[PDB]
Amino acid sequence: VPTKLEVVAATPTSLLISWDADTYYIWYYRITYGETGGNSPVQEFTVPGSSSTATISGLSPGVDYTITVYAFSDYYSSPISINYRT
């Protein structure tokens, strides 16, 4: 359901992701982010379905991260993932 995941604003320690989806039918999202590869740990937090942006902070400068978005719907979704280096 969610598509077009991009980093629309970025600082060396914080990011702002955005995606396109039919937010009217989406209950909430699960945002996961962590260092790419090597079985690195990941952190999770929830975002209400009405919005289409999320803020990730506390990141390390110059690290390739993996950001995945899990859309969940209650009225009626495969996740999307990208990579960004701060």
Partner 1 sequence: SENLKHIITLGQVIHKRCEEMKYCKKQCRRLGHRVLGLIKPLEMLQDQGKRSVPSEKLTTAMNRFKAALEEANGEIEKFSNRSNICRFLTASQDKILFKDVNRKLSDVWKELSLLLQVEQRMPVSPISQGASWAQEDQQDADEDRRAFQMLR
Instruction: Name the site residues for partner 1 (rule: CB under 8 A).
Output: 5, 36-37, 64, 80-83, 85
52 binds Zn ion (CB under 5 A): no
The answer to whether the beta carbons of residues 44 and 31 sit under 8 Å apart is: yes
44 binds Zn ion (CB under 5 A): no
DSSP bridge pairs for 49 = none
CA 79 to chain centre: 10
What secondary structure does DSSP assign to 36-48, as a single string?
Answer: SSTT--EEEEEEE
Give the separation between CA 33 and CA 86, rounded to whole angstroms.
13
83 binds Zn ion (CB under 5 A): yes
User: How near is the Cβ of 54 to Zn ion at its closest, in Å?
Assistant: 16
Per-position x/- string for 4-43, each x denoting binding to Zn ion as judged by CB under 5 A, each - no binding: --x-----------------------------x-------
Q: Which is nearer to partner 1, 27 or 80 (CB)?
A: 80
